[PDB]
Structures are given as C-alpha cells and as structure tokens.
C-alpha cells in the first residue's frame, strides 16, 4: 500500500482514535479500529484500517498492544502509518 506521516498537535485533548492488535493480540501489526468523526485524528487524516508503523520515530510494527499504547501516551505527535 502506501505510507504516510501524520502529525498531530499535542493540545491536551484526546487523540480521537482507537487501536487494536499487537504482537500479542494473523494479520500482524497495530491497527486503527475507530476514528471519532470530528476528533483530532480524523481531521488530521487518520483512517480506520491504518497500520501504525512508528510513533514519534519509535518503531511499533512488531509491538505488543500495550507497548503501542505507551508510545501513543508518552509537543507534536508523529504517526507513521501504512494504508491499503
């Protein structure tokens, strides 16, 4: 498919996205399962089904669910994602 960087401002609200998957949870990776319709992730271009590859430059391709959660919560948030 295609890889995009998506940068979100860290303005203190929710990101407005949900993830599933992880190396402990067949199709491998951490995926965006929900993007709240008017939230920051949606406005920023994130889409359901996107695979999170990297969080602020940190590789999460083979991360467990909880490892990816920790990276997301850790001034801007850079998400490298793959789609299609």
């Amino acid at each position: 498919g295609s890889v995009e960087e998506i940068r979100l401002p860290r303005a203190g609200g929710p990101l407005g996205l949900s993830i599933v998957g992880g190396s402990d949870h067949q199709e491998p990776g951490v995926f965006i399962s929900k993007v709240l319709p008017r939230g920051l992730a949606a406005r920023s271009g994130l889409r359901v089904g996107d695979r999170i590859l990297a969080v602020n430059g940190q590789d999460v391709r083979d991360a467990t669910h909880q490892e990816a959660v920790s990276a997301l919560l850790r001034l801007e948030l850079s998400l490298l994602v793959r789609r299609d």
């Binding site: 929710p14 949900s18 993830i19 599933v20 949870h25 399962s33 929900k34 669910h65 959660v69």
Partner: peptide, 6 residues
C-alpha cells in the same frame, strides 16, 4: 484482546 481509545 482489547481496543484502547486515546
């Protein structure tokens, strides 16, 4: 399995 909203 889980889904985590942030």
């Amino acid at each position: 399995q889980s889904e985590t909203s942030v």
